[PDB]
């Protein structure tokens, strides 16, 4: 029942959170575009994709006659967003890449795919389209970081350590509203640990290293 006051209420926060992610992602990729001149056009492309996602999700909100609680969503993203900004200012492209392209993208992939089977038919269509783009964004980050892994390794570990716990906290924060929308926490935690562990394996981390990196997240709750 997409019309109930309890579905509308949870949707107000989830829709707003998703919209903030897409909008925030737009700025992250534009900022990366400055920091990685060799990848400037490509990163600009990924930015414009995020813009379209934002519009797509604003339209999912209107379809269910829900005003997004943007204030709640700004606060949801705040810590992780300020960490990205500070990294950009420091010239730390690797940290900015791991945040947005790996931690974050992955997060949207796991949650979005879980949302698809329980989503109203308008939003299901919008979401199927956005998730397709997300695979690309994650692949871009994996490809760059695997190509530059030795130079990048130590900063990735450090960035993972500061930022993965922020995503776990975001995960806990959304859990109850997500359930109302028909999305189980257990699937979301699992699909995220899997997606991010595989991304870490794919760029070059060992079993012990992935366990260490993953554990910084799981331990924060
Ligand atoms: C209406 C969308 C339903 C899915 C909501 C997922 C719950 C919280 C995850 C939000 C993650 C936002 C990340 C967007 C980043 C874009 O590249
Ligand atoms: Fe996106
Ligand atoms: Fe994205």
Name the packing angle between helices 207-218 and 185-203 (round to 10°): 140
Q: Which residues surround ligand 2, an ion (CB under 5 A)?
A: 22, 50, 53
The tokens describing 106, both together, are: 């992955």
Q: How far is the CA of 105 from the centre of ligand 2 (A)?
A: 7
Please name the residue whose Cα sits nearest to atom 4 of ligand 1: 112
C-alpha to C-alpha distances, 122 to 60, 62, 64, 109, 179, nearest whole angstrom = 7, 11, 9, 19, 20
Tokens 């604003």, residue located: 58
In short, whether 168's Cβ falls inside 6 Å of ligand 1 is no
Are 83 and 96 within 8 A, CB to CB? no
Closest CA to 120 of 180, 183, 60: 60
Give the residues after which the backbone of the chain is interrupted, taking a C-to-next-N distance over 2.5 angstroms as a break: none
3-class SS string, 7-59: HHHHHHHHHHHHHHHHHHHHHHHHHHHHHCHHHHHHHHHHHHHHHHHHHHHHH
Q: How far is the CA of 218 from the centre of ligand 3 (A)?
A: 23
Q: Which two tokens stand for residue 118?
A: 């329980």
**Is CATH 1.20.1260.10 the right assignment for the domain spanning 4-221?**
yes
User: For residues 148 and 163, what is the distance between their CA atoms, to the nearest angstrom?
Assistant: 20
Long-range contact pairs involving 147-152 (C-beta distance under 8 Å, separation at least 24): 148/94, 149/203, 149/204, 152/94
How deeply is 206 buried, as exposed, middle or buried, from its count of CB atoms within 10 A (0-12, 13-18, 19+)? exposed
Number of Cβ within 10 Å of residue 48's Cβ equals 11
Distance, CA of 138 to CA of 98 (rounded, Å):
9
3-state secondary structure the chain: CCCCHHHHHHHHHHHHHHHHHHHHHHHHHHHHHHHCHHHHHHHHHHHHHHHHHHHHHHHHHHHCCCCCCHHHHHHHHHHHHHHHHHHHHCCCHHHHHHHHHHHHHHHHHHHHHHHHHHCCHHHHHHHHHHHHHHHHHHHHHHHHHHHCHHHHHHHHHHHHHHHHHHHHHHHHHHHHHHHHCCCCHHHHHHHHHHHHHHHHHHHCCCHHHHHHHHHHHHCCC
CA count, 13 A, side-chain hemisphere, 161: 8
Residues with Cβ within 8 Å of residue 37, at least 6 apart in sequence: none
How many CB atoms neighbour CB 67 within 10 A? 12
Euclidean distance between CA atoms 177 and 115, whole angstroms: 12
Residue 1: Cβ within 10 Å count:
7
DSSP H or E segment with residue 118: none
d(CA 131, CA 108): 8
Cα–Cα dist 122/63, whole Å: 8
Asked if 22 and 112 touch (Cβ cutoff 8 Å), the reply is no
> Where are the chain's structural domains?
4-221
Distances (CA, A) of 48 to 30, 130, 180: 9, 12, 31
Measured by CA distance, the residue closest to atom 14 of ligand 1 is 21
């Amino acid at each position: 029942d997409f019309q109930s006051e309890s579905y509308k209420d949870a949707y107000s926060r989830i829709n707003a959170i998703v919209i903030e992610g897409e909008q925030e992602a737009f700025d992250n990729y534009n900022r990366l575009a400055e920091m990685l001149p060799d990848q400037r056009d490509e990163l600009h492309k990924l930015a414009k994709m995020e813009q379209r996602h934002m519009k797509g999700f604003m339209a999912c909100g209107k379809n269910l006659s829900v005003t997004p609680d943007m204030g709640f969503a700004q606060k949801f993203f705040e810590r992780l967003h300020e960490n990205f900004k500070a990294a950009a200012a420091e010239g730390k492209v690797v940290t900015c890449l791991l945040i947005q392209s790996l931690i974050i993208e992955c997060f949207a992939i796991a949650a979005y795919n879980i949302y698809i089977p329980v989503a109203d038919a308008f939003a299901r269509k919008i979401t199927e389209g956005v998730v397709r783009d997300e695979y690309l964004h994650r692949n871009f980050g994996e490809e760059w970081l695997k190509a530059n892994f030795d130079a990048s390794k130590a900063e990735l570990e450090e960035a993972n350590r500061q930022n993965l716990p922020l995503v776990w906290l975001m995960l806990n924060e959304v859990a109850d509203d997500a359930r109302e929308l028909g999305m189980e926490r257990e699937s979301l935690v699992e699909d995220f640990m899997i997606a991010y562990g595989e991304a870490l394996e794919n760029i070059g981390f060992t079993t012990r290293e992935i366990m260490r990196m993953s554990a910084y997240g799981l331990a924060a709750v």
